[PDB]
Amino acid sequence: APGTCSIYGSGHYITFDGKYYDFDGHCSYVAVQDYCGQNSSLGSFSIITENVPCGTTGVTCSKAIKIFMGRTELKLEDKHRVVIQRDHVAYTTREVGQYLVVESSTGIIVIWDKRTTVFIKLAPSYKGTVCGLCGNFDHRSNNDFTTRDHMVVSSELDFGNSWKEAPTCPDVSTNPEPCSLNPHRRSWAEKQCSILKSSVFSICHSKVDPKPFYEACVHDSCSCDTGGDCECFCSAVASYAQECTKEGACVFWRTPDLCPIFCDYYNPPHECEWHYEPCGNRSFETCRTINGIHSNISVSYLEGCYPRCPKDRPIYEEDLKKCVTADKCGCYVEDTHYPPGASVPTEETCKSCVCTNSSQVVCRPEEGFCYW
Ligand SMILES: *[C@@H]1O[C@H](CO)[C@@H](O)[C@H](O)[C@H]1NC(C)=O
Ligand SMILES: [Ca+2]
């Protein structure tokens, strides 16, 4: 029973609690934090999305995600996870299918597709104790629009604006209407996006209502008018797929003509490792699934290109893109991978260290005084 916030395409949001709503601000904003009480200082983590305008109609798209876990700051930007400041909470950074996943010992998962979409998973412990654009995760939709000042509002725009992180950003006064703005895109938009209501997604229509996702798929196909509309369309179908695969109803919607994916590209010369899985596979073992964070909270189900490793080397080792035996993974220290044999660094005195040929990190003193 975790909660999931979604932020995708050109300004669409799904609170932990099931409220769909659009908001298009050109600022950084608080997707969710637990600094939500009366005290400035009382809380743990904030997750920020930096949004930018995308297209000419005035909509805005998510471009980066900032993660604060206590005094630690991470950014997801330019297809990377980069570290801005660190002193220590534990997090691990895996690539999973299409996505890039940051996972923390404290119940927090960020799932990012390296473009406009992010999912945020919180462990059930956080119920009630969060706030921001994702709501407060208390099973009640009616009340997610709580301003940073603890007032309830009906206005999408007041809500969103009160969760801006830099006060010099201007406020939003209007919610753009891209299809009326760009009627010459209405037809293509409604045709492509009509897959979401078609037979292909039949099984999911019991579990997830496709109206909001269809409407945002059209929104975006009209608003992506500067280049690259097929990525806005495909992103928008994929967000729906996800909710399905979550709520049980994995759909194989991709085809060579519609939103093709090129997993075969990653295959070496005479091999057939890499393959598209539309629902992941739950028993996917990587070197980082085994030696990093192990939360109750599942990410296996994401679509992407996955490798198939042999019996003789069942464990995919992300960092060197090779298959290996569990004991030849290497070492992880502060989410940094050292291979067997490599030397592991040490802000400690007279103490040298090594990652062994068995994926353990062990240290040795140096008597050059200092001893055992
Ligand atoms: C909470 O606010 C009080 C003042 O209301 C302040 O003394 C305190 O340092 C703040 N943070 C805490 C107690 O962690
Ligand atoms: Ca709520």
Numbering used by the authors: 856 to 942, 946 to 1226, 1237 to 1240
Text of the article:
Mucin glycoproteins are the main structural component of mucus and thus play a central role in protecting exposed epithelia from pathogens and mechanical damage.
Diffraction data were collected to 2.7 Å resolution. The structure of the MUC2D3 protomer shares the constituent folds and overall organization of the homologous regions of VWF, with the exception that E-3 is not packed as tightly against the VWD3 β-sandwich as in VWF. Cys1130, located in the TIL-3 domain, was suggested to be involved in MUC2 oligomerization, and its participation was confirmed by the MUC2D3 structure, in which Cys1130 bonds with its symmetry-mate across the dimer interface. Although a second cysteine is not necessary for dimerization, Cys1088, located at the amino terminus of a helix in the C8–3 domain, was found to form an additional intersubunit disulfide. In addition to the areas around the two intermolecular disulfides, a third point of contact between the subunits in the dimer is observed midway between the disulfides, where a proline side chain (P1114) inserts into a hydrophobic pocket lined on three sides by aromatic side chains (F1120, Y1123, Y1124) and on the fourth by an intrasubunit disulfide (C1121–C1163). The small and predominantly polar multimerization interface observed in MUC2D3 may explain why it does not form readily in the early stages of protein assembly and why it may require a particular pH range, ion concentration, or other factors found further along the secretory pathway.
